[PDB]
Design a binder for this molecule. Structure first.
Ligand SMILES: *[C@@H]1O[C@H](CO)[C@@H](O)[C@H](O)[C@H]1NC(C)=O
Lengths: 39, 50
């Protein structure tokens, strides 16, 4: 059971929020590419 | 809200149809400054503060 979230202490000025569909021996291989081009 | 504590709602990541508001008969003032109401339904903005 997931009952522990300790990643932040505050959230003051939000510009953008986006809720989406979930993306997700070792059985799974997940490749991701993150790019910051022209905003 | 009261005018001293006016509510601000940030509107992002959706489609804003302004012709529904402009063609309503329920509004007495629809005074736009800096832009015309006819091209609001065409133009695109980063955020909307209500
Ligand atoms: C950012 O947050 C601080 C404190 O929460 C506030 O004083 C400031 O006016 C905010 N700026 C914007 C642009 O929202």
């Amino acid at each position: 059971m997931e009952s522990e979230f300790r990643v932040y202490s505050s959230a003051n000025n939000c510009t953008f929020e986006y809720v989406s569909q979930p993306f997700l021996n070792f059985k799974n291989l997940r490749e991701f590419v993150f790019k910051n081009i022209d905003g | 809200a009261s005018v001293y504590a006016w509510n601000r709602k940030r509107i992002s990541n959706c489609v804003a149809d302004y012709s529904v508001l402009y063609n309503s008969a329920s509004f007495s003032t629809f005074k736009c400054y800096g832009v015309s109401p006819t091209k609001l339904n065409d133009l695109c903005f980063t955020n909307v503060y209500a």
